Ligand binder design. Structure first.
Ligand SMILES: [Ca+2]
Ligand SMILES: [Ca+2]
Ligand SMILES: [Ca+2]
Ligand SMILES: [Ca+2]
Ligand SMILES: [Ca+2]
Ligand SMILES: [Ca+2]
Lengths: 174, 174
């Protein structure tokens, strides 16, 4: 599925933090460390960040190539299989809440525009691309992202075979 | 809803590891600690256990009371709200992969009867209560619970308003 392959390629890109062509725990370790240095947050949030981002690999991605590096082909091949069973979606969707927890640096349980902008910036993206993605997730227009909005949009990104506004969940498509 | 409420109360009973009437991070920490004692896995897995278990609280239950200890009624009402929007199911089911990762002490991506049994024993249940639940989960009778099998069963537990074989997912109902 064209657009669907394109979304996976995009996600792969954004999460391949060190850009070496393979998803590894190292990507999440480094992303966390940068995030902890450069963002404003509650002091205790630095540990949360590390646990939650590394937990993406530890509890989810580790199951893809059983322990090591995931190349772009294996990623797509793997996800392709994973989305097949409508009853096991949480294996694909599971990481959203962890991403959410890391991004909520003031731990108020909502993601604000500033927190989202910082997130895009951690992924190496131009902060000026955040609003279009934020806006797609903020369905009630209250100017915040609730856990519910975040997971619903993220779920759409991963699962929709067709075009939707959530195709830009992880920034601009490659 | 009567049975659903019963299941929620049962999940609540189970995770309230100390039995103080409140679910707190400490529950998971103490559970982590006892889990490690009861199994006799390799060193590297000890940390996995801790990380995985506390991760249930850190990323999922903290969304319930802004970080404080959750009482039974608060728990059930939250759950009632959470299960209403099926598109957001991952907030509820999100923890299953975490539990899986903790229970698979030999990091082989499968849960054996031994491993499952330690999990039950761990939770204050007698290992004879286990086989009942195992077999409900092992839908292809190959004597191993795969990640997919674990989350499908767990999801039925959480989401089925009606009776099903998976109501015993967390052991005998209270
Ligand atoms: Ca990488
Ligand atoms: Ca926030
Ligand atoms: Ca909103
Ligand atoms: Ca407790
Ligand atoms: Ca195992
Ligand atoms: Ca099986």
């Amino acid at each position: 599925s064209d657009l669907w392959v394109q979304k996976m390629k995009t996600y792969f890109n954004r999460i391949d933090f060190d850009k070496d062509g393979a998803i590894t725990r190292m990507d999440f370790e480094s992303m966390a460390e940068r995030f902890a240095k450069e963002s404003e947050m509650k002091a205790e949030h630095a540990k949360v960040l590390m646990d939650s981002l590394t937990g993406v690999w530890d509890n989810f991605l580790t199951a893809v190539a059983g322990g090591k590096g995931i190349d772009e082909t294996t990623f797509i091949n793997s996800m392709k299989e994973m989305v097949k069973n409508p009853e096991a979606k949480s294996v694909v969707e599971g990481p959203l809440p962890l991403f959410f927890r890391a991004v909520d640096t003031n731990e108020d349980n909502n993601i604000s525009r500033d927190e989202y902008g910082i997130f895009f910036g951690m992924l190496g993206l131009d902060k000026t691309m955040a609003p279009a993605s934020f806006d797609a997730i903020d369905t009630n227009n209250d100017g915040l992202l609730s856990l519910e909005e975040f997971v619903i949009a993220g779920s759409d990104f991963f699962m929709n075979d067709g075009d939707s506004t959530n195709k830009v969940f992880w920034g601009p498509l490659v």
